[PDB]
Design a protein around this ligand. Sequence first.
Ligand SMILES: N[C@H](CCC(=O)N[C@@H](CS)C(=O)NCC(=O)O)C(=O)O
Ligand SMILES: N[C@H](CCC(=O)N[C@@H](CS)C(=O)NCC(=O)O)C(=O)O
Lengths: 204, 204
Amino acid sequence: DHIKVIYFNGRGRAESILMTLVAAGVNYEDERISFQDWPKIKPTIPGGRLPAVKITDNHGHVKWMVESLAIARYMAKKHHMMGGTEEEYYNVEKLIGQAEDLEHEYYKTLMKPEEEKQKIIKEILNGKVPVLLDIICESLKASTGKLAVGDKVTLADLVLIAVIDHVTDLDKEFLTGKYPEIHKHRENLLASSPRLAKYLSDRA
Amino acid sequence: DHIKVIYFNGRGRAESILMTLVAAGVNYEDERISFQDWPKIKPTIPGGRLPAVKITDNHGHVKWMVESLAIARYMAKKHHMMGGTEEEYYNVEKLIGQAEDLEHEYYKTLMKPEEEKQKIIKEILNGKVPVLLDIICESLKASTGKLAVGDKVTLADLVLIAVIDHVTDLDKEFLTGKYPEIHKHRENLLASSPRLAKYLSDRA
Ligand SMILES: N[C@H](CCC(=O)N[C@@H](CS)C(=O)NCC(=O)O)C(=O)O
Ligand SMILES: N[C@H](CCC(=O)N[C@@H](CS)C(=O)NCC(=O)O)C(=O)O
């Protein structure tokens, strides 16, 4: 199957999809759409929104998928990255939900004039952000292995790395000297997934 | 097992958990915590946040669960409400993600003075809300059965009903004469789940 991932230029919602395929060792085509080209392409995308995934097989079948984390969960399940038991499934989902909570705080800062952007950053960094980082640390602490859940890569590992990258976009040193569990998780994940480490280093 | 669901007084994040147990016919204890009693109870809750679920078996084991939709997904999976195939799993998750997007627009209106609350309501109702309602309508259209995904209740059905209830909290008539798929889905769901219909009618 040819898998084409269609998104805007950056690590936004598509990152969960990209990292899942990378970690699972699945080949795919990147299609980054520029702001200027979007109006033309928008009507050709079922549902008119990105990320979208177009899967084409060698017998002419075309499957369109939308909703970034639903795509990511589907692919993760296919490649045994959603937990091997019900309990591990719950713990995978628990960390995804916590990471997504944190992501929504980050979202508050987007498409705002610099002036109120810094006010929001200060608000969230003095409010919900450290609360969620600690809660995530507790989730990581409870793992029986080196990763979010056990010793094998799950979607939870991938969503966490992406959201932490957004936190450090807001304040580069926010995690410095703090949250040892999150730092250790990043080390362990990159150690366990050379494919992901290479991907993260290569990223434009 | 005794299942105790702990939340604040209302339909907020706990609703997905409550509706899942109701639809699956699982008995549980409701524990609603008042604003005034929260400070005392907060330290006794692992992670210090609600919803939380405490499950106690008849051999003294105590299991604590947090993160509302991770709990809901876990319970839904246990009771065959997350899809019967990978494709149905994806479609369940697609509608959950769409419904949660809509929920986050609703969240924008919370804990705001009446003045800017109405400005935000007008903004979202003229912006992302109708966009997401239509996208949800398309998801429903693509079902092979009467419900969100097939003919049997899934977590997607339940999350959708709860989020639509929040939209109508903001504007009672927003769906009137519009979004026929959403109206039909509500009818079909209540028809298919007398347990849920009774629960929704009884709600305080
Ligand atoms: N629930 C999201 C929704 C994606 C979304 O918000 N897409 C926006 C990203 S800019 C979009 O494509 N918007 C407007 C447009 O397509 O014109 C997902 O994770 O896929
Ligand atoms: N991701 C959410 C997080 C829940 C949450 O935001 N809980 C708030 C609801 S008011 C809370 O308990 N907050 C503050 C406190 O416990 O003092 C979930 O769905 O469970």
